[PDB]
Design a protein around this ligand. Sequence first.
Ligand SMILES: Cc1ccsc1C(=O)O
Ligand SMILES: [Fe+3]
Ligand SMILES: [Fe+3]
Length: 298
Amino acid sequence: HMLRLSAPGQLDDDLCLLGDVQVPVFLLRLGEASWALVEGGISRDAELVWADLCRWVADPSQVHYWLITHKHYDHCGLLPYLCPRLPNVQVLASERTCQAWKSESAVRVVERLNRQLLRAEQRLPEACAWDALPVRAVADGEWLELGPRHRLQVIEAHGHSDDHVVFYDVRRRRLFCGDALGEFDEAEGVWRPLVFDDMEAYLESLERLQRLPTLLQLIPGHGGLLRGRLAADGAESAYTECLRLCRRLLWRQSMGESLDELSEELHRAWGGQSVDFLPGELHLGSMRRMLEILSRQA
Ligand SMILES: Cc1ccsc1C(=O)O
Ligand SMILES: [Fe+3]
Ligand SMILES: [Fe+3]
C-alpha cells in the first residue's frame, strides 16, 4: 500500500525506521553530526535496534535526544539497555512518565513483561538503573528545539494511559502519536481503540489532535508510517472507531451479555496482529480492561 510505509530503513529524507515495524524506533537526522530517537521499544530488541542504528550513525555519541511517548513496557523497554551505549543522549519524557521510572512497582511490571518476550537463551546487555536514566521532563505545549530544521511540540494526549504525550513536527506536518489513536488494523485499514486508562480523556485528546494543521505523516507506536488520507483523517477516524466500539458494547450488554463475550471476540478478531510483542494473556486482558473502562463511563 502506498499510504502505509512499513519496511525497516529510510522513510523520508530525515527519518529512518529501526528494528521491527511492529515495535519500531524512529531515527531522526537533526544535522550533519546530530540525531534523535523516537519511541523506546521492547528490551529484547536491544541488539537489533543497536545494529540498525549503527548502519546509519557512525558515531553514536551523536545521538542527542530520545523522545518517549508513554510508560508502557513496549514504549520504553530499550532505555536501560541502550542508554549506556549513547553517552550524550537525553531522554525526553513527560513528568508522569519520568515518575513511573522512579516507582519500584512500576519498573517491576515493565521488566516482567519485557522478559516474557525474550527468546530462549537470550541475554540482555548490561543495563543502567531505571532511576538513573538521563531524563529531562517535558511539559504540555513545550517546543523541543532538536535541530536547525527540527522543532517538535509536546502535546498531552492522556486516555490510552494517564501519562501519554505525542510529538508534532509542524514543518513536516508529522505527528508521532504513540498509542493515542489506537492500533492501526493492517488488514482492514481502520483504527482499533486502545483505551486503557480513561475514555473521556482519550476522546478529548483525539478532539484536540484533530484541530492540528492537516497531517501529512502519522506515525503511531506500532505498524509504521501512515500518509495521504490515513494521516489527514487519522484522529477523526480514531474517535469514530472508539464510539463504534462503545455502541457495540452497549448493544451486547443490552442483550444480557457479560463483558467476557465481547472481550473474547475482540481478542479473536484483533489479537493476531500484536502476538509477537504482547505476551500470551495480555491482549485478552487488555481488551477486558478497555471494555471495563468503556462500560463504567457508558
Ligand atoms: C498494540 C496493542 C494491542 C493491545 S494493547 C497494545 C498496546 O500497544 O498498548
Ligand atoms: Fe501503550
Ligand atoms: Fe503500545
